[PDB]
Design a protein around this ligand. Structure first.
Ligand SMILES: NC(=O)C1=CN([C@@H]2O[C@H](COP(=O)(O)OP(=O)(O)OC[C@H]3O[C@@H](n4cnc5c(N)ncnc54)[C@H](OP(=O)(O)O)[C@@H]3O)[C@@H](O)[C@H]2O)C=CC1
Ligand code: SF4
Ligand code: SF4
Ligand code: SF4
Lengths: 154, 347, 134, 216, 68, 199, 395, 101, 60
């Protein structure tokens, strides 16, 4: 039984990590680097990452841009509409810690204040390969999880 | 209003700042059961004021995601592998902590863990580990109002035995005893709603005679903060009942009213019958894993605790001693969550 | 300039040019020389309301006289366009645009100032002029 | 007027000689003489169009701004058909703190002009939207950033700042970081605004030299 | 004139809610919740004067306090 | 091509104008009436047979068979120049002594204020930093700090795979920066030798 | 005694939120529509207002260049160019010919990438996705040139007061020239697929009609002017670098509709290719930054060998140069229109006031007039032709 | 002391031509829209003295100096150290505005 | 480069050598329209044009 539960959990991890439906909150500079990362030269669809316009059908959310006080309620609202796993990736200095507009009256110092962040991708803008490195880091985080074994031994 | 200090020894030295997220509070807290419904709000209150919270959790990254946002950098510490039977891990968790809050409890039994383990063995071992340290200054334990040694339900009996063991080992511990807690992630209104809507029939033990005093989650979280801000509260048990006492029939009726259900779906499943329908199913639970289909409501323990009046004793400590006015759970913001579903002008 | 249309058209026709660049939007009228003369003379009649010894009126009189002269020697309507660096249609619209602000100038009367009026003017001297030579 | 494409080939010239001269050296004198009541002072300085030339700057009072703008747009010799932008500069040392700046283009003259109206916090500047439709958003932004009220504006509302923002950020007395901060609360499942706290304070580095002379 | 400016700004504040620029959570956060909190507030009448309470609280009274 | 038909338009009012007025026949860009039977057949077959559509179809189908341009990111990496500005790294002299002399120019030139430096006299007597931390969530990777350093102590290394799972790991300190300099020493040295020729 | 005639009422005050197949950035658009026809459009901006203008006031002049790179993430070089030109005018600094050539070259390169993004994202908003992916490979080829010269693919910060940050690496001119040999063929491939396509013609013709008077009234610039029949280009009417030497022709259309502006943008790409070829052939040899070391940093060997150069390096990387008291407005022909900076200096090492004139601000203001009588589908096309960038609109 | 004879000429001339309308003390503070507790802070109006290290007279009130030298500064408030990174943390909104601008 | 061994900034200092002169203009004196329109062409032949500046100033 302990072997079967492990086989089930590794299959579920393969399914979740291979097929990541990301929703792109393309505020600012970093959205175009993501555009390039999903272009012909880097094939994210080969990796299984294919962007989905609506939050209800997306399991991973990428905050790429400067979060403003005007936008933060909309960011949280979009995040809440997502289904239960809802992993969040922070891309760029602006999203990670406010960055170059850090000491501003209208800028939120990091999307971590508004939404929980699983992976931080550093850069201004982050290189597309750096974004793929962060996505692979998230895939490893998903692979690490063994939810079904803990359900057995809960 | 004047901010009141956290009454911890040598807090005056370490504390600095206005008391916000980025401020320094001299409280390092190990909240067991942080990812739970009660624990998350306690973590939010402690960490919101600039304090550092250590959150031991059983491996589940998605469940502990909200706790990441709770505090500033390095304030919310998430320890990956928590086991109630591992002493060394418990010592490591409370190494730097000067206050420990225990919110670990199980609504239902499984094969791996029974009531006697979680509600008795873990409190005693943790009590010994906290006692040997000496750095820990405040201990808070969260229990049900109806917990009693002479209780038919095994859950509420084991909880009282564990509370007595904690009081024995740590004499200055405070036993917080809230009523049925209402919240967005609560198991009171959410289970009642799921019963009314996605269940064929809503069984009500007896006719709903049993009286209860539900309280809002923010009120319990504030009561925890007021416990920690006063050292005179140590060694005392607080029955955090709600402002209004209601029978279960009133709550069911008012849920039906707010949701604008077509009619009354509740049925009379009197006692002495649930005690025969669920009695084998408890033994079924103790030999099978956690299953969403059946749980909590469909148990003899729930029937036994729904035939008694879970109300605060007359002479008792409560919200008034903590200078808190509890908010009504049948109106206002508390009732918004069920209100969003349907109000008869909705869908 | 370069036309961005693959179709081949003749730009020396002096009407296909105007149709291509959209002068018809500015005015549906053809915009002949006589219309320009009429517009200039109507502007001259209009500016009569401004007092005779007003600098604005003298300026408008001088400009209208200069353009009536430019109409004089040049018998070709295209030649007037070359000298004045404008299409005849927009040259005609110019006088009407001048006409629109005469009411606004007659309400405030900017030309009325006291006989001691003095507007200080500050002028910039470049260092390149002095450093290279004097 | 409107620089409708006319010459198909050999339009290599930047402009004609006379058009350049009338605007290189007679433009300020022409404006002052033609409309003296509107003008209070004039400055000729480094050019907006280019490094080598010189374009005028005219200082006028708020009451005359609408008539001066109408004259500038529709005068035959001076056809400033375009409003590039509207801006304010805060000078706290002065009693009249704000200088509302208007930037114009004449396509016919290939020239730029700058118009300044000096006001204070209480006084208002008449809107010039009827002269140039582009002014509406520029005046809304000036009201938002500096707090300068524009009279007879069709609907004067804030544009850039957050909803509920009452302070004017580009005022020199406004803190760089502001007064409030935005955070999501777990207890109340809402994004809320709170008084400011900084993990690391803004570090002002005073680099001024005693020996410098350019500072005025 | 200052009164005129204040009235114009207050009209703007009203128009934000009226035109749905601001949202329901904004109205909850900024008006309704503090008023309800104030009604629900129970406080002990402090025997210490105003100076003593601020002296016990913090060294610099001008700095604000959060979650009082 | 560029030529447009009276019928095809995106605006209702313009469609009404062209249906009920013949100013379109004056305009040069439009296509004129066929004026011959054969021209009528030509236009009719062009519109009815979707000719222009098929012409695009062949050019798109050329996409199927042409050499695909794509990079397998883990196995193959995109070309990176020596000037590339990536993860920061403090450097050491070949003897093992840190190049930093705590001039603090890099902290003064930092546009984002990401560098905090505090120094002291070391026991030997050297001017050395007791703290050199860089906020990589506040860095903009401009490279101004690498330009301002007079001793080449701070450089932006060639590494762009430095994502983390928590924000605290992105607040670098002197020990971490020195470790990054040790890890990438040879590559940084080669890049600097190449760059010295230009500047 | 003659009956009066009543009218109809408009409702449906919709909220068109941030929407991915549109001009990039976040747009909140409140539209009042009588049925399927729009009667008023009120764009809500400030969702990417980062307080850039006030942050500039707290930084030195050299510390504020990356702000201009990040104002417009599509066209960085043109945005920083106006700032450096304004500082140069106030400082009275003369740029060497090699640096002037490098600025013109990279301005044309960023113009080309901007036009590629504009056209292909507009086609994507219409619904054709092949030109979009066919274009990213070219845009990558140009980003590699950026990463070669500056080390950053997007935010180069290459333009500096008095010249360029570093010299052109050896071998760069050949690679740019090869990209140029194939660029015309790539553009022709894209043009055949878009131009002449019946659905594209129907979608874009007679949509977003603007007239020359309307364009001047609303303060529009660039492709909007040139698609309506206005022969106005800053690079020709008000030259700012060695652009005066360059030989190229203004593209002109007359209708003012969406299709005309698309054709104008394609022809602008071709003209920029011609300008790049001229720059490549006539690229001079010599200094790339100004010889004056009181406004430009000395070279590293020179600072390491000379005392005066170390002093200048220290005082330029700590205090910065002092800009004489004065005001200037310098504008450049950005790919999106006319981008200008109004710089006010009081004589210090920091700008007193740095107003940024957005070309897209006036276009978004013109949105309401243009998008009157249109449909829900037409809004995306109208936004596409304006090509608005909201970080550029919201400073 | 003689004259700058530069842009400062037009600056001073613009100063003397124009003027501000008188209002009651404190009325503008309500128009500003900032928190009213900002005006509870106390103000020190002073001119910095010369630094002892340097002998230049620019920063001092001297006829050589043509720049504004009188600052409004607010009283210093609490500052602490970030527990994680030892950075200097503050809650004073008006910390650097008066000194800087 | 002739600046290696010949250093003289004050000769090559354009930043600090700018100045502003002052004039007063009055409405009494009439404007000279002879200057504006006497030099204006009356025929296409007399048209004179200003060529675009090829390069911006450089020190060389
Ligand atoms: N209605 C209420 O909410 C009321 C609650 N209480 C008491 O408060 C306590 C918790 O409240 P609530 O939060 O609602 O209960 P929850 O079950 O929601 O929280 C339980 C927490 O305990 C942890 N936990 C349970 N068993 C184990 C175990 N064997 N080893 C390690 N961790 C464990 C869970 O972690 P995991 O998620 O991994 O299981 C979870 O974090 C209970 O004792 C309850 O009786 C008091 C009054 C009313
Ligand atoms: S991190 Fe840099 S590139 Fe990304 S959005 Fe912010 S400024 Fe633009
Ligand atoms: S690269 Fe730029 S922003 Fe980053 S630390 Fe260096 S100077 Fe600061
Ligand atoms: S890294 Fe370089 S610039 Fe920074 S303090 Fe050290 S020596 Fe100075």
């Amino acid at each position: 039984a302990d072997f079967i539960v492990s086989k089930v959990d590794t299959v579920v991890n393969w399914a979740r990590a291979g097929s990541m439906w990301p929703m792109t909150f393309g505020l600012a500079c970093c959205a175009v680097e993501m555009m390039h990362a999903g272009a012909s030269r880097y094939d994210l669809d080969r990796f299984g990452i294919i962007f989905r316009p609506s939050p209800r059908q997306s399991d991973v959310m990428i905050v790429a841009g400067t979060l403003t006080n005007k936008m933060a309620p909309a960011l949280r609202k979009v995040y809440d509409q997502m289904p239960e796993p809802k992993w969040v990736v922070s891309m760029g200095s602006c999203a990670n810690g406010g960055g170059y507009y850090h000491y501003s009256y209208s800028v939120v110092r990091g999307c971590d204040r508004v939404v929980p962040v699983d992976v931080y991708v550093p850069g201004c803008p982050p290189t597309a390969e750096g974004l793929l490195y962060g996505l692979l880091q998230l895939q490893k985080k998903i692979y690490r999880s063994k939810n079904t074994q803990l359900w057995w031994n809960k | 209003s004047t901010l009141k200090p956290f009454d911890l020894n040598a807090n005056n030295a370490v504390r600095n700042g206005p008391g916000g997220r980025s401020s320094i509070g001299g409280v390092v807290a190990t909240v067991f059961g942080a990812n739970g419904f009660i624990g998350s709000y306690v973590v939010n209150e402690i960490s919101k004021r600039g304090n550092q919270v250590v959150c031991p959790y059983r491996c589940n990254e998605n469940k502990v995601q909200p706790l990441k946002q709770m505090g500033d950098l390095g304030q919310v510490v998430l320890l990956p592998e928590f086991d109630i039977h591992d002493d060394e891990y418990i010592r490591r968790a409370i190494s730097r902590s000067n206050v420990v809050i225990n919110c670990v409890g199980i609504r239902q039994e499984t094969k791996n863990y029974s009531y006697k383990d979680v509600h008795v063995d873990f409190p005693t071992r943790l009590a010994k580990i906290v006692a040997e340290s000496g750095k820990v200054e405040r201990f808070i334990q969260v229990s049900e109002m109806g917990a009693d040694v002479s209780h038919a339900s095994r859950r509420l009996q084991t909880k009282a035995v564990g509370d007595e063991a904690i009081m024995k080992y740590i004499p200055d511990a405070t036993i917080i005893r809230p009523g049925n807690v209402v919240g967005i992630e609560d198991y009171f209104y959410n289970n009642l709603i799921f019963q009314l809507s996605y269940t064929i029939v809503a069984p009500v033990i007896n006719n709903g005679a049993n009286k209860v005093q539900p309280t809002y989650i923010l009120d319990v979280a504030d009561a925890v903060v007021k416990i920690l801000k006063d050292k005179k509260t140590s060694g005392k048990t607080y029955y955090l009942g709600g402002p209004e006492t209601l029978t279960m029939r009133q709550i069911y009726d008012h849920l039906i009213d707010t949701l604008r259900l077509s009619n009354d779906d509740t049925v009379n499943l009197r006692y002495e019958l649930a005690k025969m329908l669920y009695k084998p199913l408890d033994t079924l639970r103790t030999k099978l894993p956690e299953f969403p289909f059946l749980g909590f409501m469909m148990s003899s323990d729930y029937a036994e605790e729904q035939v008694a009046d879970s109300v605060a004793p007359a002479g008792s400590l409560g919200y008034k001693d903590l200078s808190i006015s509890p908010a009504k759970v049948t109106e206002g913001l508390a009732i918004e969550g069920v209100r969003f579903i349907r109000v008869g002008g909705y869908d | 300039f370069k036309a961005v249309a693959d179709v081949e058209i003749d730009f020396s026709n002096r009407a296909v040019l105007k149709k291509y660049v959209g002068v018809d939007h500015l005015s549906k009228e053809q915009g002949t020389k006589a219309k320009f003369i009429v517009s200039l003379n109507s502007l001259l009649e209009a500016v009569k309301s401004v007092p005779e010894t007003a600098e604005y009126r003298k300026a408008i009189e001088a400009t209208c006289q200069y353009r009536l002269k430019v109409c004089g020697e040049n018998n070709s309507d295209a030649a007037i366009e070359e000298v004045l660096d404008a299409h005849l249609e927009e040259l005609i619209a110019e006088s009407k645009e001048e006409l629109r602000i005469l009411p606004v100038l007659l309400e405030s009367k900017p030309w009325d100032v006291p006989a001691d009026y003095s507007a200080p003017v500050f002028d910039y001297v470049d260092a390149s002029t002095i450093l290279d030579k004097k | 007027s409107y620089c409708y494409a006319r010459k198909m080939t050999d339009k290599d010239y930047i402009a004609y000689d006379n058009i350049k001269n009338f605007g290189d050296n007679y433009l300020t004198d022409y404006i002052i003489k033609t409309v003296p009541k509107y003008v209070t002072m004039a400055v000729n300085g480094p050019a907006q169009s280019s490094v080598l030339y010189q374009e005028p700057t005219i200082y006028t009072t708020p009451e005359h701004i609408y008539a001066l703008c109408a004259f500038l747009r529709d005068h035959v010799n001076l056809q400033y058909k375009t409003l590039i932008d509207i801006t304010a500069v805060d000078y706290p040392e002065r009693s009249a703190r704000f200088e509302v700046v208007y930037h114009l283009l004449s396509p016919r003259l290939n020239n730029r002009i700058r118009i300044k109206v000096v006001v204070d916090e209480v006084t208002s500047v008449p809107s010039v939207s009827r002269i140039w439709n582009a002014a509406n958003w520029f005046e809304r932004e000036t009201w938002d950033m500096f707090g300068v009220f524009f009279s007879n504006h069709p609907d004067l509302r804030r544009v850039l700042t957050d909803y509920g923002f009452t302070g004017h950020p580009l005022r020199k007395d406004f803190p760089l970081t502001g007064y409030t901060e935005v955070r999501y609360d777990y207890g109340k499942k809402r994004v809320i605004s709170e008084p400011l706290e900084l993990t690391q304070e803004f570090r002002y580095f005073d680099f001024s030299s005693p020996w410098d002379t350019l500072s005025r | 004139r200052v009164t005129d400016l204040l009235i114009f700004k207050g009209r703007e504040e009203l128009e934000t809610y009226l035109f749905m620029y601001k949202q329901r959570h904004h109205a909850i956060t900024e008006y309704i919740e503090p008023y309800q909190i104030k009604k629900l507030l129970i406080e002990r009448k402090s025997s210490n004067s105003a100076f003593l309470d601020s002296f016990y609280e913090k060294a610099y009274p001008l700095v604000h306090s959060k979650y009082a | 091509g560029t030529e447009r038909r009276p019928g095809q338009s995106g605006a209702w009012k313009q469609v009404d104008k062209q249906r009920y007025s013949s100013e379109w026949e004056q305009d040069p860009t439009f296509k004129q009436v066929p004026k011959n039977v054969s021209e009528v057949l030509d236009d009719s077959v062009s519109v009815l047979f979707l000719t222009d559509i098929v012409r695009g179809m062949m050019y798109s189908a050329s996409g199927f068979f042409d050499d695909k341009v794509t990079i397998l990111y883990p196995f193959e990496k995109g070309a990176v120049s020596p000037r590339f500005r990536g993860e920061h790294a403090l450097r050491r002299y070949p003897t093992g002594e840190e190049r930093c002399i705590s001039c603090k120019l890099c902290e003064a030139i930092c546009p984002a204020q990401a560098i905090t430096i505090e120094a002291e006299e070391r026991e030997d007597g050297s001017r050395k930093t007791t703290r050199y931390d860089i906020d990589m969530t506040k860095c903009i990777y401009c490279g101004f700090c690498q330009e301002a350093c007079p001793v080449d102590a701070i450089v932006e290394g060639p590494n762009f795979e430095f994502s983390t799972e928590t924000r605290e790991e992105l607040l670098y300190d002197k020990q971490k920066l020195l470790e990054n300099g040790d890890k990438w020493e040879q590559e940084i040295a080669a890049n600097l030798r190449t760059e010295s020729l230009y500047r | 005694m003659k009956p009066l005639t009543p009218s109809k009422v408009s409702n449906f005050t919709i909220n068109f939120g941030p929407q991915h197949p549109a001009a990039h950035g976040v747009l909140r658009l409140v539209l009042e529509m009588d049925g399927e026809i729009i009667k008023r459009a009120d764009p809500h901006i400030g969702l990417l207002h980062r307080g850039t203008e006030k942050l500039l006031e707290y930084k030195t002049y050299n510390q504020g260049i990356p702000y201009f790179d990040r104002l417009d993430y599509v066209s960085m070089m043109c945005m920083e160019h106006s700032y450096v030109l304004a500082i140069e005018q106030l400082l009275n600094v003369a740029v060497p010919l090699r640096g002037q050539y490098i600025r013109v070259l990279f301005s044309e390169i960023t113009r080309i990438m901007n036009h590629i993004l504009a056209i292909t994202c507009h086609s994507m908003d219409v619904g054709a996705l092949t030109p979009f992916l066919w274009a990213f490979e070219e845009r990558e080829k140009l980003f590699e040139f950026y990463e070669r010269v500056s080390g950053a693919r997007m935010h180069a910060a290459y333009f500096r007061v008095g010249g360029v940050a570093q010299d052109l690496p050896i071998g760069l001119l050949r690679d740019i020239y090869d990209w140029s040999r194939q660029f015309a063929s790539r553009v022709d491939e894209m043009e055949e697929l878009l131009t002449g396509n019946r659905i594209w013609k129907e979608r874009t013709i007679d949509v977003g009609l603007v007239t020359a008077q309307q364009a001047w009234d609303w303060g529009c610039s660039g492709p909007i002017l040139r698609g309506s029949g206005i022969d106005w280009d800053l690079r020709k009417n008000q030259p700012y670098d060695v652009y005066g030497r360059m030989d190229f022709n203004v593209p002109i259309a007359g209708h003012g509709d969406c299709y005309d502006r698309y054709l104008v943008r394609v022809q602008e790409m071709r003209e920029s290719l011609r300008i790049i070829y001229q720059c490549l052939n006539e690229m001079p040899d010599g200094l790339y930054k100004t010889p004056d070391q009181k406004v430009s940093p000395p070279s590293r060997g020179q600072m390491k060998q000379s005392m005066e150069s170390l002093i200048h390096h220290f005082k330029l990387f700590s205090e910065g140069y002092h800009v004489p008291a004065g005001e200037t407005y310098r504008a450049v022909e950005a790919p999106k229109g006319e981008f200008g900076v109004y710089l006010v200096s009081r004589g210090g090492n920091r700008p007193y006031r740095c107003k940024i004139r957005s070309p897209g601000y006036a276009h978004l203001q013109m949105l309401d007039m243009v998008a009157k009588g249109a449909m829900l589908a037409d809004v995306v096309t109208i936004i596409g032709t304006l090509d608005v960038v909201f970080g550029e609109i919201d400073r | 002391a003689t004259a700058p004879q530069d842009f400062s000429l037009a600056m001073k001339k613009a100063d003397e031509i124009y003027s501000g309308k008188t209002v009651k003390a404190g009325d503008i503070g309500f128009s500003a829209g900032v928190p009213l507790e900002t005006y509870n802070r106390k103000v020190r109006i002073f001119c910095p003295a010369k630094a002892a290290s340097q002998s230049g007279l620019g920063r001092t009130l001297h006829p050589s100096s043509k720049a504004p030298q009188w600052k409004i500064v607010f009283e210093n408030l609490s500052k602490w150290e970030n527990p994680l990174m030892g950075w200097t943390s503050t809650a004073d909104p008006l910390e650097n505005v008066g000194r800087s601008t | 480069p002739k600046l290696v061994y010949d250093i003289k900034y004050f000769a090559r200092d354009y930043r600090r050598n700018n100045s502003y002169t002052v004039r007063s203009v009055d409405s009494k004196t009439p404007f000279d329209y002879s200057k504006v329109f006497g030099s204006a062409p009356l025929k296409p032949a007399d048209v004179k044009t200003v060529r675009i500046p090829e390069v911006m100033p450089h020190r060389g």
